Amino acid sequence: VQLQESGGGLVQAGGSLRLSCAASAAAAAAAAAGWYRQAPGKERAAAAAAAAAAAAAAADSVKGRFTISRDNAKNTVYLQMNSLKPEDTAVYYCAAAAAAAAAAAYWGQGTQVTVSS
Amino acid sequence: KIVNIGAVLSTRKHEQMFREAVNQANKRHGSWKIQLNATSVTHKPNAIQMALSVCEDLISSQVYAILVSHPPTPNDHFTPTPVSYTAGFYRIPVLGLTTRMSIYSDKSIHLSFLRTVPPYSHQSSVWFEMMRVYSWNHIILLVSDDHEGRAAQKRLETLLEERESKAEKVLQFDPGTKNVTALLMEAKELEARVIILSASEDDAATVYRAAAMLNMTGSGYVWLVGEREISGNALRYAPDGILGLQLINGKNESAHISDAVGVVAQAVHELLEKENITDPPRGCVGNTNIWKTGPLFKRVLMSSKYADGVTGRVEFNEDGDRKFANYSIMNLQNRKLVQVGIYNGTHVIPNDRKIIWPGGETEKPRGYQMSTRLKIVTIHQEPFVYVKPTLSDGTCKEEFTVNGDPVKKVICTGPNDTSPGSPRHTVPQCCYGFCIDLLIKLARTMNFTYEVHLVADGKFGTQERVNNSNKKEWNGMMGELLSGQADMIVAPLTINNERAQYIEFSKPFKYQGLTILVKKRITGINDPRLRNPSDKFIYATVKQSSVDIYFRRQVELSTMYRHMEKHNYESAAEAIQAVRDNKLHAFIWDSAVLEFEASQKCDLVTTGELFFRSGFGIGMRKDSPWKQNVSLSILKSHENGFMEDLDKTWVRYQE
Amino acid sequence: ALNIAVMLGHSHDVTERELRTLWGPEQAAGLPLDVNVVALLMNRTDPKSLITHVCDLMSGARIHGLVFGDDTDQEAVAQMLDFISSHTFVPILGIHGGASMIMADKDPTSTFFQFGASIQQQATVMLKIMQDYDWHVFSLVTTIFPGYREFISFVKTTVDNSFVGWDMQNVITLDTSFEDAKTQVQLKKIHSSVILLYSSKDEAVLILSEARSLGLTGYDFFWIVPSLVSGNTELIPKEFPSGLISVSYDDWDYSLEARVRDGIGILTTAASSMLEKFSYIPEAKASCYGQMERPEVPMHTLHPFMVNVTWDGKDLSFTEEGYQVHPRLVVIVLNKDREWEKVGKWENHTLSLRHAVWPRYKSFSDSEPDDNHLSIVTLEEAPFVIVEDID
Ligand SMILES: *[C@@H]1O[C@H](CO)[C@@H](O)[C@H](O)[C@H]1NC(C)=O
């Protein structure tokens, strides 16, 4: 499978954005969708997740700034992010795992989000 | 309204009968609520043109039902298969005035077909009931391989499974052949004399000639056939006194069409109900739509009722059989048929002269003769049977053991005297011991003589499916008895569920269990030293034995089962020598054999005590005529007590 | 000079198909044999139209043989074709699902040589696919539709032979004659997960409709159907739960021209083998059989030489009953958009699947709790958990 991420740009601090990752598949009900962040000099970090059952987990680090949502009808997961801070400058990535497959870690090209004065 | 019914005949003269039939259908009821009209078609010098004309007749009116009749030619299915499939293409029900081929009875092959005459198949249950009345338990069946053969096999199998008597000797002979004598000779030794035939006239005649050749047509034999085997050239030459039967109403033609018209009129009158009658398909152009209300018409017509008439009240079966009608018993009295009785399916009422049988003696033909000799198979187990080489004079040495009175010995053949390597060798020897003396006592009790053989290879017996079949052929003596090589097993054979499923056992005569053999940490079956694998002690058994299936029928001992299957021997005394040679640590086997071997030999110790108890018993083929005397003899032996005397002779005092 | 004709009923793909298939045998040939072709088509077909055409065409050009193709999945047209070929003693080879719907076969006098999977061949894959994810074949529900006797008998023998698993418990049948909730009474008496049924297309709509009322169309259940159930169509009816397993022959990616080309080669090469072996002339009937059938009866047929055919990279050898031993079975599912999508392929006796574990997607909407089917993670350690390679 292959995905595609988009939605980045330059936005002043305190602003908002709508990132999005999408993929093609006939079974789209059952995939974990996760967001990963990797800044220069730091290891890759988890940001937000969505489960198959329909539960939401938010990381405590930047808790409350953004929100996750998934559409069962249309194969796309888009991340609504609000109250931007300079600490969030990184390239966000989307991924899936399980329901078959192998070699399970899937990474898009990357979308860079820039927060600055 | 106007209701239309179609009929197909081959007369052009009983077309007057068809006109009278439509007139009678009008006469039964003509109140203008239901009105009847009819159509007719000629016979078949071809098939395509008549099929087209039948289609034209169908499109002519709002047809609802069809009737067909018999042909003059010997073409087995000339007239039926054109109309049958064409009508089933639209699920329009049809009635068969006269036909007996069993192909159409299979609703899986063709559409809904209802027969006013029973097929060949269900009459088999009729003479089955006849034989049950006259108490025939062992029967022989001889059938062909055609569709009639398959149908007769299925019907007879169902009838037998109703009582589950497991009829034996299912042999079939190739159809349309000559000079085939093997089958009758093969079936001659089944110790029973009643055979059932079902085939064409020419095949029946060939079988008659063969039987006359092989002399099986004299006295002591009784055997009946159906109706298709007592007509034409078959009736030309045949043995006297052939029991047979004739249909209730054979070739009544225009009568049965009258009954069919009456019953179909009753069914239609009862049908004038339900939510979506719509209309019956009409026209051959653009009418491929399914006949939606088809199955309901068949269901209601099947459960109809009609009581006034020559045919009689009928409650059709689940597939359209004639249900229960009547039948006539015939016999051959010097080339002249004669009625001897009438059987209404449920019973037989003899209302004629006496029926003399081919031998000429009026005595009941209930021979089932008990032969004097029976087959015996055994296995080489030390404490019970010992193989002895005979001397050069032909008799092995006599031996007055303890009291001067000679010990009985018998001449036993069969083995190669070398199990591992032997291309082909059968040799005679002497057998003597416990079971032999027991068998001698039994024979002296029940007045019969014996013949002794030995097993082909040496394995006791175990179900095993590997290849060349879709089942587990019983290797060893267990399958030697099943396949018919043997008739009785006198050996230390323990009893378990799997074997009990097939063969029938008698009461046991000596209890035992399983025990561990050790040579002088060993304890009962609780220790980790035995629960978990370890190289300190290596356990094994004899392959294809009761212990194998016992350890393979427990999920909790899979590791032990795999360890045992890693390596095991096939021997009785060789393993004892090996453990005596310090090569093997310990192994498990039966109780009596191990206990006798330990004390009789030197420097042996019995490990622990029994964990799983079981008994030894004589095994016989299921449903044998010997169950009764055997048990009473065994209990008489237990009461008198000289079985204990034999035990004292053989396993008590080693001096 | 060999004769062949193709028929298309209610189809709009014939015109170009005939021309392309025409040039096919010329190069596909490896034997200096000879080939002639003709094509025809018709609207909604009936037996009378079918029977009229065959001798009209046969009497016209002295047909050596014909290849058949039709659609709409009618059981009647299957039994219509065979008995025509039986009497005319002409080799007729029909290639499409409507013609290829299974039949119990007829007397050996016929020369039909059907082109499709047998009941036994189809079923054994269905039982085998259970050995992948769902353990025990739970229930069998069938009507009185023909062919049931061979089916329930075969599965019962194979389940009681292999010791592993396979604890089949309940098998039931229903009488459509009592078309009322009495069926729901017998149907309500089975509680399990995987349900296997063997019935006709029309009854399939009603029985699945009844289950949705009671609740067997729930998220926890699996339905398995043979090929004949709705296989020969692209327009699915309603009342079928979203998510269904069938093994069929429909051959999504195959073309009729590809099948016809193989069928033509079966005709020419097999006859070439018999004719050249003994200088054999395939004597044709002077007409459709009114009287002139008898002299050709003693003439040996192609059955000894038509059982084995080669080329095209597939052992196309037939059998006594007319079913192949190297078929092209595929397994296919109902997706979310009610559009059938291929899943796995069967070849050389293996189950190759694009899915490793079951997808577990919902039935028709307005009923989706979906709160079950937990996933569990574990570590290999001291005797708490032990790992082993598959036997
Ligand atoms: C048992 O013995 C009696 C003794 O007369 C004899 O009827 C027959 O041998 C046996 N009977 C049965 C029913 O087995």
**What gap in Å lies between CA C199 and CA C148, rounded to an integer?**
9
Cβ contacts of B304 within 8 Å, gap of 6 or more:
B263, B266, B267, B270, B316
Do B and C have ≥3 inter-chain CB pairs under 8 A?
yes
For the stretch C248-278, what's the b/e string if a residue is b when 16 or more beta carbons lie within 10 angstroms of its beta carbon?
Answer: bbbeeeeebbebbbbbbbbbbbbbbbbbeee
How far is Cα C264 from Cα C2, in angstroms, rounded to an integer? Answer: 10
For residue B286, give the chain C residue with the closest CA: C44
What tokens does C185 get? 């009474």
CB neighbours of residue B279 within 10 Å: 7
Contact across the interface for A98 and C341, Cβ inside 8 Å: no
CA-based angle B11:B13:B16, to the nearest 5?
Answer: 120
Instruction: Give the CB-side neighbour count of residue A46, counting CA atoms within 13 A.
Output: 10
- Of the candidates B306, B384, B348, B266, the residue with the CA atom closest to the CA atom of residue B29: B266
Task: Check residue B289 and report its DSSP letter.
Answer: S
- Any alpha helices (H) in B272-313, and if so which ranges? 294-302
Secondary structure element (H or E) that encloses residue B4, with its range: strand B2-6
Give long-range contacts, CB 8 A cutoff, 24+ apart: C350-358.
C351/C128, C351/C129, C351/C132, C353/C132, C354/A100, C355/A100, C356/A100, C356/A101, C356/A102, C357/A99, C357/A100, C357/C133, C358/C133, C358/C134
Return the bridge partners of B507, or none.
Answer: none
Q: What is the dihedral of CA C118, C121, C125, C128, to 10 degrees?
A: 140
C-alpha closest to that of C218 among C253, C252, C242: C242
Alpha-carbon distances of B531 from B23, B557, B563, rounded to whole Å? 91, 9, 11
Q: Round to whole Å and give the CA distance between B341 and B355.
A: 9
In 3D, which of B376, B571, B363 has the Cα closest to residue B459?
A: B571
Task: Give the Cα separation of B406 and A85 in Å (integer).
Answer: 114
Cβ pair B331, B242 in contact under 8 A = yes
Beta carbon pairs, B and C, within 8 Å: 58
d(CA B415, CA B97): 65
User: What is the CB-side half-sphere exposure of residue B392 using CA atoms within 13 A?
Assistant: 0
Task: Count the helix, strand and coil residues of chain A and give each as a percent rounded to the nearest 5.
Answer: 5, 45, 50
Of C341, C356, C362, the CB nearest to A29: C362
How far is residue B640's CA from residue B377's CA, in Å, rounded to a whole number? 28
Q: Which residues pair with B225 in a beta bridge?
A: B197
Atom of ligand 1 nearest to the CA of B446: 9
Residue at token pair 């009495």: C182
Provide the greatest CA pair distance for chain C. Answer: 87
Rounded CA-CA distance A27/A99 in Å is 9
Which residue of chain C has the CA closest to B91?
C76
Tokens, residue B200:
């064409």
The protein residue whose alpha carbon is closest to atom 2 in ligand 1 is B629
Instruction: Give exposure, B250-275, as e/b (b: 16+ Cβ within 10 Å).
Output: eebbbebbbbbbbbbbbbbeebeeee
DSSP B337: E
Hey, is the C-beta of C144 within 8 angstroms of any chain B C-beta?
Answer: yes
Among candidate residues C316, C327, C261, C228, the one with its CA nearest the CA of residue C6 = C261
**DSSP bridge partners of B411:** B430
Give the chains touching B; criterion: ≥3 Cβ pairs < 8 Å.
C
HSE value, Cβ hemisphere, 13 Å, CA-based, for B42: 8
Q: Are the beta carbons of A91 and A113 closer than 8 angstroms?
A: yes
Find the helix or strand (DSSP H, E) in which B519 lies: strand B510-519
Are B484 and B606 in contact by the 8 Å Cβ rule? The answer is: no
C-alpha to C-alpha distance for B498 and B482, rounded to whole angstroms:
14
Does residue B17 sit in helix, strand or coil?
helix
Is C352 touching A (CB cutoff 8 A)?
A: no
Between CA B489 and CA B495 the distance in angstroms is 13
3-state DSSP call for residue B539?
A: coil
Distance separating alpha carbons of residues B383 and C169, to the nearest angstrom: 47
**Is C83 within 8 Å of B81 when comparing Cβ atoms?**
yes
The residue type at C74: Q
CA distances to C158, C183, C186, C212, C241 from C189, in Å: 25, 10, 6, 15, 21
Cα A83 from Cα A73, distance rounded (Å):
29
For chain B, positions 15-74, list CB contacts with chain C under 8 A: 46-48, 51-52, 55
Contacts of the segment B313-319: beta carbons below 8 A, 24+ positions apart: B314/B116, B314/B263, B316/B114, B319/B105, B319/B107
Take residue B172 and report the two structure tokens written for it. 């079939």
**Taking CA B539 as the corner, what is the angle to CA B534 and CA B541, rounded to the nearest 5 degrees?**
160
Cβ–Cβ pairs < 8 A, chains A and C: 24
How far is the C-alpha of B520 from the C-alpha of B535, rounded, in Å?
19
Contacts of B454 (CB under 8 A, 6+ apart): B377, B378, B379, B380, B412, B413, B414, B415
Q: How far is the CA of B628 from the centre of ligand 1 (A)?
A: 7
Q: CA neighbours within 13 Å on the CB side: how many for C355?
A: 18
Q: How far is CA B231 from CA B1, B330, B542, in A?
A: 47, 13, 61
CA B586 to CA B354: how far, in whole Å?
Answer: 74
Nearest CA among A31, A19, A86, A88 for reference residue A59: A88
Give the C-alpha separation, B135 to B129, whole Å: 9
Q: Å from B300 to nearest chain C CA?
A: 9
Which class for A40: exposed (0-12), middle (13-18), buried (19 or more C-beta within 10 A)?
exposed
- Phi and psi angles of residue C112, each rounded to the nearest 5 degrees, phi first: -110, -50
Q: Which helix (H) or strand (E) holds B437?
A: helix B434-446
Atom number in ligand 1 closest to CA B629:
1
Beta bridge partners of B343: B327, B348
CB B218 within 8 A of CB B239: no
Mark yes or no for CB contact B89/C45 under 8 Å.
Answer: no
Q: Name every residue whose Cβ is closer than 8 Å to that of residue B264 and which is 6 or more positions away in sequence.
A: B5, B65, B95, B301
Tell me whether C361 touches chain A (CB under 8 Å).
yes
Phi-psi region of B274 (alpha: psi -120 to 50; beta: other; left: phi over 0): left
Residue B645 labelled as part of a binding site: no
Closest residue to B107, CB basis, from C55, C146, C290: C146
Among residues B112, B118, B58, the alpha carbon closest in space to that of B85 is found at B112
**Separation of alpha carbons B119 and B126, rounded Å:** 12
Helix (H) or strand (E) holding C172: strand C170-173
User: Which structure tokens are listed for C298?
Assistant: 């003693």
Q: Is A99 an 8 Å CB contact of chain C?
A: yes
Angle at CA B494, nearest 5°, toward B493 and B500? 100
Q: What's this structure's resolution in Å?
A: 4.2
Per-residue DSSP letter, B121? H
Residues from chain B that touch C143, judged by Cβ atoms under 8 A, are none
Angle value at C-alpha B374, between B370 and B376, nearest 5 degrees: 155
Quote the distance between the C-alpha of residue B358 and its chain's center. Answer: 28
CB-defined site of ligand 1, < 6 Å: B 628-629
Q: How far is the CA of B504 from the centre of ligand 1 (A)?
A: 18
Are B107 and C80 inside 8 Å of each other by CB? no
| Distance in angstroms (rounded) separating the CA atoms of residues B508 and B522 | 31
> Considering only CA atoms, which of B421, B245, B270, B422 is closest in space to residue B345?
B245
Question: What is the DSSP code (8-state) at residue B509?
Answer: S
In sequence order, what are the residues at sequence separation of 6 or more whose Cβ sits closer than 8 angstroms to the Cβ of residue B577? none
The dihedral sign for the CA sequence B29, B30, B36, B42: positive
**CA-proximal residue: ligand 1, atom 3 (nearest):** B629
Rg of chain B (C-alpha set): 35
Interface of A with C in 51-70 (CB under 8 A): 53-54
Contact between C362 and A98 using a beta-carbon 8 Å cutoff: no
Q: Which residues pair with B346 in a beta bridge?
A: none
